[PDB]
Automatic annotation (TrEMBL), chain D:
It comes from Rattus norvegicus (Rat). Keywords: Ion transport, Membrane, Transmembrane, Transmembrane helix, Transport. It comes from the Eukaryota. Subunit of the V1 complex of vacuolar(H+)-ATPase (V-ATPase), a multisubunit enzyme composed of a peripheral complex (V1) that hydrolyzes ATP and a membrane integral complex (V0) that translocates protons. V-ATPase is responsible for acidifying and maintaining the pH of intracellular compartments and in some cell types, is targeted to the plasma membrane, where it is responsible for acidifying the extracellular environment. May play a role in cilium biogenesis through regulation of the transport and the localization of proteins to the cilium. This is V-type proton ATPase subunit D. Its main location: membrane. The keyword Transport applies.
From TrEMBL, chain E:
Belongs to the ATPase alpha/beta chains family. PANTHER family: V-TYPE PROTON ATPASE CATALYTIC SUBUNIT A. GO terms for biological process: ATP metabolic process; homeostatic process. Residues 214-439 form the ATPase F1/V1/A1 complex alpha/beta subunit nucleotide-binding domain. The lineage of its organism: Eukaryota, Metazoa, Chordata, Craniata, Vertebrata. Mg(2+) 2 binds at T241, E263, E267, D333. It comes from Rattus norvegicus (Rat). ADP binds at G237, C238, G239, K240, T241, V242, R264, F429, Q506, G508. Its EC number is 7.1.2.2. It catalyses: ATP + H2O + 4 H(+)(in) = ADP + phosphate + 5 H(+)(out). Transmembrane segments: none annotated. Pfam families: ATP-synt_ab, ATP-synt_ab_N, ATP-synt_ab_Xtn, ATP-synt_VA_C. This is V-type proton ATPase catalytic subunit A.
From TrEMBL, chain F:
It comes from Legionella pneumophila subsp. pneumophila (strain Philadelphia 1 / ATCC 33152 / DSM 7513). This is Uncharacterized protein. It comes from the Bacteria. The modification N6,N6-dimethyllysine is found at K22, K126, K177, K198. The chain holds residues 4 to 235 of 573 of the full protein.
Amino acid sequence: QQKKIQMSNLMNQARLKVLRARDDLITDLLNEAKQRLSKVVKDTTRYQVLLDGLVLQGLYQLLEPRMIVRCRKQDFPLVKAAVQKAIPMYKIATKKDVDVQIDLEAYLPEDIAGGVEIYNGDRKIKVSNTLESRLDLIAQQMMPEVRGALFGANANRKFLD
Amino acid sequence: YLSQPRLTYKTVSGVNGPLVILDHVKFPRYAEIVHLTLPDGTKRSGQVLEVSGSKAVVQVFEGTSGIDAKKTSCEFTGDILRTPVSEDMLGRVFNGSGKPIDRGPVVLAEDFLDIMGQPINPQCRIYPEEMIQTGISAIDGMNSIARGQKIPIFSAAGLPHNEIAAQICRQAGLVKKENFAIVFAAMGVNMETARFFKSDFEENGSMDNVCLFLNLANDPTIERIITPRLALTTAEFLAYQCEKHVLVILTDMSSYAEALREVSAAREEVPGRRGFPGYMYTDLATIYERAGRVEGRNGSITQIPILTMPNDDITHPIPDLTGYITEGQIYVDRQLHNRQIYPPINVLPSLSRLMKSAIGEGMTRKDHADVSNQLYACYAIGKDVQAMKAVVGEEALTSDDLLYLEFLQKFEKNFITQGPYENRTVYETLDIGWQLLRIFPKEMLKRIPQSTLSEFYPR
Amino acid sequence: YLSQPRLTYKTVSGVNGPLVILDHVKFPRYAEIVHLTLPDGTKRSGQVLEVSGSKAVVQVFEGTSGIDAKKTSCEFTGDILRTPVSEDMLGRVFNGSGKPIDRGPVVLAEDFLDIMGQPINPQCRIYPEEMIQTGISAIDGMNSIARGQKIPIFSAAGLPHNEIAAQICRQAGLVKKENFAIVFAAMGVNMETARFFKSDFEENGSMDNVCLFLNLANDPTIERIITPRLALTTAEFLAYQCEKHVLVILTDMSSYAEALREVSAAREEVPGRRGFPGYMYTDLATIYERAGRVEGRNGSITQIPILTMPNDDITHPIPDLTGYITEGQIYVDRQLHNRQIYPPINVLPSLSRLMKSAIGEGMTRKDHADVSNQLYACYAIGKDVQAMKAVVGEEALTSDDLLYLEFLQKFEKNFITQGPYENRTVYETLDIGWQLLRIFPKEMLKRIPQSTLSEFYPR
Amino acid sequence: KDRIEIFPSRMAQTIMKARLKGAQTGRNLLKKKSDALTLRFRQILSFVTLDEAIKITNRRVNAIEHVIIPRIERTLAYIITELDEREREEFYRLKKIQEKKKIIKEKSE
Amino acid sequence: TFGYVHGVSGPVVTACDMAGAAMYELVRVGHSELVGEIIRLEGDMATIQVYEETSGVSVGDPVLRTGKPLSVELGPGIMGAIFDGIQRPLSDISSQTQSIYIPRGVNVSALSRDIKWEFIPSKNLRVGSHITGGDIYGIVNENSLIKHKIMLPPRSRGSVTYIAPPGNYDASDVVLELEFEGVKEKLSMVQVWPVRQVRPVTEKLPANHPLLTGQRVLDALFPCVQGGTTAIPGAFGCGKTVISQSLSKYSNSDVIIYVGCGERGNEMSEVLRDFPELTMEVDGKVESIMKRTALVANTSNMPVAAREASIYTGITLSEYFRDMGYHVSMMADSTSRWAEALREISGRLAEMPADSGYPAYLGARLASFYERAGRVKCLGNPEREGSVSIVGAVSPPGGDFSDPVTSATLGIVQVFWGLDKKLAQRKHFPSVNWLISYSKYMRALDEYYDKHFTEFVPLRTKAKEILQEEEDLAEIVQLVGKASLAETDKITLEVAKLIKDDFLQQNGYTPYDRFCPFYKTVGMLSNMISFYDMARRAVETTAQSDNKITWSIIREHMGEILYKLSSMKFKDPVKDGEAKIKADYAQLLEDMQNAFRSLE
Amino acid sequence: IKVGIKMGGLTSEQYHSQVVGKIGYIARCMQTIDPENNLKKIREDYQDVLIWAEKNYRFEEILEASKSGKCPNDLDALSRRSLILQELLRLVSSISPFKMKLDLIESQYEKMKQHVNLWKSDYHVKLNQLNQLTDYLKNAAPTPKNNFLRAMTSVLQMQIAQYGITEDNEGINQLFKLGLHLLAMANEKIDEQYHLFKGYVKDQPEESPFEGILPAEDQKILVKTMIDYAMP
Ligand SMILES: Nc1ncnc2c1ncn2[C@@H]1O[C@H](COP(=O)(O)OP(=O)(O)O)[C@@H](O)[C@H]1O
Ligand SMILES: [Mg+2]
């Protein structure tokens, strides 16, 4: 009796050990992705384009008459442009006049890779569209494909229902 | 997938019992999940049970104690509780919220399935035609289990329904004379019960094929009504996408019903009996009917939703509505347990709806159906004789009555009594049946035709 | 003459179950009538249940299905449903709203009467006396019926209350030492019963004096709330203006009470026992009490309403409130029916309030009152004997109990049991009564004075 | 069979409780009759007539204990439960009525 | 033409901007276009009952307003098919989506438009002919069992302008063209009828013909008729589903519509597997049963609102075939699950409840459902005669026949087949109580029985008297101990056992009890009653003599007769036909008479 | 005051629509059963219905005539009058190869018309039994069973054409029993099929029961089938 319960414990721990190792591999990828996104942010000619979209994207989700755009101070010149080019479009897609201001007193932490968060007039409704939030929001949904892409498909799964 | 950023609100309108009501919500979605953070950093989740205009009513799983009105921060995931599922969940232990508690990592999903599930198209559902050998004569003979059947054990507080379920997990095979993946939802139980099963599964050497979901008596009562769906959702993945035969055991379903009743009272829903929601049946069907084989796929799900009967009342809504949904029940009682009979299974009030297809030529032995029906007649009559003799006395009985008392006494100690590790085949069970039936002369075995008695009775 | 054009509204506020709510209505009149024209041209009618400001709630008789909230035209009649009535309504069949169903024309308005009823001054009400000889020994002997009485028949589902009511109708008459007009209100009656009564009236040649109002089980359930008021309004015309004697049959006040419950729930009224409106007592009283004789007239109205008793009880609010309003009952039982006794009438829970005065020397027979009481007491005792016998056995009874048991058995066989096509007179009924009483020695007949015994008992 | 089958009511509670008290009193009085016959029987040990009288008395006592009272108790417990079920559905309706009144009051403000 | 979703509380959805919408119109809620039906109107907002799960529905979702009410497509292609609760074929969904789950928002034609049907006109119509509602202007050969009559829909009439010659046509073509007053109508083989409206008939007729049931009890003692209505309010395990399956398998009806409204999913699969393997000879040829049956599945774990649509779809289908001159015997195996759906919706609606939480109008819905049964003279010049019977189960909680649904049902249905849980526990199947059950059609069928049998009626009466007398004795025997019983009473008690064990119960899963032809039921009953009368006479003529034939004397002397009488069930009517069974029963009667002559 | 008449059980509009159809139906039945208008007695008996048909009337004009009371608008009485003709039509049509004498047709009409309830009468049952036999043979393979049913059915049709269905003639009564028994008999059980047919042929009083009933080509197949069966 003692031998087989000890081997069961050992096999169960071995299963947990390899599972933890697999999760470490997934984390290393995501941490590399974060660094890769930072390298993209450093490129003004592509980061400004992201900001152009990211600001407008948040604006469409709130659909409020008053907007406050919050960013890290370092990127303010580009958020300013992203807002300026976003309003003409907003007034066309929604047919609603929106007063969009940038918060010059409150800033995002300096260690945020990039992106913006947008608040409504009373700061009760906010959308978080920074690069870390997008990376996790997408990665958590694409994970089923990452699992297969890195470790192979499960040979025992035949149906997708 | 969902590429749009999710919105976060600090617009809580008010709190009433377990329900947190938000206003100013953009296009609320019905039955979507909300993640909320309390002023002290505590994270909790809930589901939108109602939307109206800009308002939404969120039922919080962990509870509403400490929920603020001004500082509470909520975000809407934008979908229903779809949960991560993978093949390698077998061998893992989860809590009632779907998170691991075995110090392993979170689930690395192969897909995300809707916890509510979908009804299986009755035209593609294939009627079960295979028998599972439980090794318990009280079941394999007179109330057989088919693969894909739903058979709860109706029990009562203090009875060894946990030992019977544990026994079934180890010695459940086939009568084709096989490794079942077990998904065990331990909800509304104490530590010792959950540790009992966890230890038994390791003792059986089968833990690598067992997935546990734990929600203990000291855990939130709202999570107790998704735990079964988490277990079944995994079972559906394993059975219908990976063609693995799965055995799903849901512990005292009465803790599910009581958790549901609390929610029903909180939402002021129309009661039926004993305060339970008038839709209790529909909700139970959502849980129970996630079972059976599907045509064209080699998997199956078999359920054993054991439940405790409050005050041994077989008409209590919990066993009553279950009895209407499941294919019968095993039913244990105190009259057998109080005499140290194990397993304490009382066949008289029991049945198996799929049993008639499961027995007989091509399945077990051709006399199976005849032996079962006659044993029921003789057992029930013996019980009737005891009811008579209790008043009139032994002297008022004739030889026709004493034979049924002899059968009844020998039946319970030879047929029902076995022991936790006595594993009998279905053929041995029938042989025992005949040994007891041969107590009576042919003329009294009125449920069996002479075309069967002439072959089997002489032995 | 109300020569003022009526307003028609499209200002529908909303529709909730059987009720249509209108707004912007000029000086709404309470209990007014509204004609509704549906978008497809279908016409329906309804009656106002309440008014408030510019709003009114209309009870739609035929049903609300198909009504929208934009185009439906609602014409306010400006008056209360005063129904056309004529002496030539006899020999006709109408539906539940008083319209022809027999391929005849719309009743020609000889005059109009307000169906709500015009209260009759108790000072001019004439006490009923003359006995109706129904032919049924259970009624003519014990619970006799006076002309102008109100004695409903209680029954449960499945009992032959339709046959008893039909038997009374064709066997009705006076105790002799010329006949009744029938006003028949069917409320929620199935087609099989509807043709049973219609055919029985035709086969006996009664249709010349029968007016039917048929609201069948498959007809609208709101309409039947007015049906009984239309039936009695015609009865009042025929009895108090045309000097006819009218027997009024109401096939089920329980489907009527349920119809009131449907409306009461729809308007979110505060219920009383078992969900019925707190004013059920009044709604029944205003129908039941439309009976009796009045000074200066020769006609009369006799009511014999029928009530199905839910769950075979007689404490359900429907029969409970009726019992407080009507003057006794027949009470058709189930234990007698299961024993193939017809009419299966139980004499113990059934009384007739006017019996003490509609019988005796000058109306029936000198001994009528004494025979009834003695038979009743003997029956009551006989039932107590059976209650003992069921426990102590037939071998543990004394001589008197056996006399009461023999009486009870012969009483139901020779007295109550009759057959649907045999009538017996009050004098024949009493002669049978004596045959049953003469089972006992005179010393045991303690409720009959000695003078009566010496005249009749030894015969 | 299992119940006397009297429709749940407060009247049924009164009748069943009186019926139960009667059955229990009869059980105790017949038990005393049996004990008196048993003592006299043992003192004698018109002998077989005592054995027959005891067997008849004990059989009736056993029936009261094993058939009639259990049946009254099951009936009474059934009545008690069903009456609380009727109380609940009244509670529900009254609660909803109070909430509807509250809603009307809020609309008026 | 659209509204917008305002709120969702589950199966009930509230929508706005629907001022012109009427009650009981169909709507399409959500971007998946979920099917629902409007219940209430509050200003310009509508309350919608949705027959598909509302999870994922958002505020602001479009709502399409459809003028047509909840309706069913009626035409060829129904028989042999299985439908969901709103008339969407499951075999077409599974063949098109390749899924095993039923997707939400599936818009699939009820009747396939690809099948080329073999159509023959009546050959009695000409251009200029006057055709009225219910007229048959051709027949489609769906199969060898049911001839599908193509009727002119009710509320339609006119002159014939074109009739399709015999040939192969599908359901999208034009078979009949008719005109009334300028307005012309072009009809195919498929008509649409709202499921909540009763199809009109010429006259509702009395039911005067048995509905044959493959059961000894539920036929000999409590007959049902063509066009009648019955209830089976059995508790769980009582076997009421098996009674419904037995009636469907082996009856004298032409078409069965089986409605699984809240039923276990395994039951509908059970039917689809087993039924194709059953036989019913037509004219010397062996044919499958499914060609004369159709079934609707709305299982317990499916949308609760759909339970109402399922019941009304089922009965509407039944009426359609009734109109064609067939005898239909539909059965909805639940009733309580439908009333349960009404309760859940009424709750979400915040309506004032009545008895035990059920809507006040519960009785209204049941009354109008059951009254659509009956033998009728059909509309239509061809003078058809048909019927719809309804055999509806009820599921009282705890087996207590006191709930509003059982109570209301018993006030509507004319045959009461009560089941006793305590008989089912003893596997005394069918678990019929036989003390509380009744049938109000006994008098109606007395004429039939006299015409074909005569002997049956006095046997039925004697059998009831024996069973009732045994119950009257059992009440006191429990207390006495069989000490004070007369010999005439002991005969009753043991013959009553003989009847109970051998006559009233039968094992429906055997080759011999799966179907019990009437001639066998009355044949073996005659023998059992003949024994009773001869055994009772034997003691009645000897009790006052110098030797009384007590039960113990006849029991030992005639033990072989008692065994033979009990064996009468094991006759296998398929292997041994009527001639052998009647001759066998005649021999048992002779054996009894000879044994009695040697006894007395 | 006509919001909901529900005349008998139909909406007034549906009731009158049924009256128009029934009038046209009788006209169609009379033209179908009697193309030459030889049955003068019966056509006169329907004159009050046929006057509204066999003429250039529009559907709406007949519908108006019903509503205005200008035609036999009693639907229940009109239905009875229709049925006693529909049953006569199928009686003649179901025996197509053997025509009835006009005197027999009129006699059968009166015998059915005078019946208290034709639908439930023996006339209807016999017609249902006949149509069960003649409908089966509409499309059947030339099997021994089907060749025997063909020969025996033609004789049944001949005898009905001579005698009608009002008198319980032993000829048609035996033929009904044997025909329905043979038809019910399982298709594979040829030994009983041959036994029943041969027993029939030599039970009839005629030397050749099929002589003049069926054509020589069918007689050649009919006898050849029996010859082959008895050959081995
Ligand atoms: N008439 C019958 N003959 C034989 N077995 C039966 C019969 N009725 C029920 N049974 C048995 O009992 C079981 C219970 O019947 P079922 O219809 O499932 O119960 P319910 O009343 O809950 O619908 C069946 O599955 C079968 O095994
Ligand atoms: Mg069932």
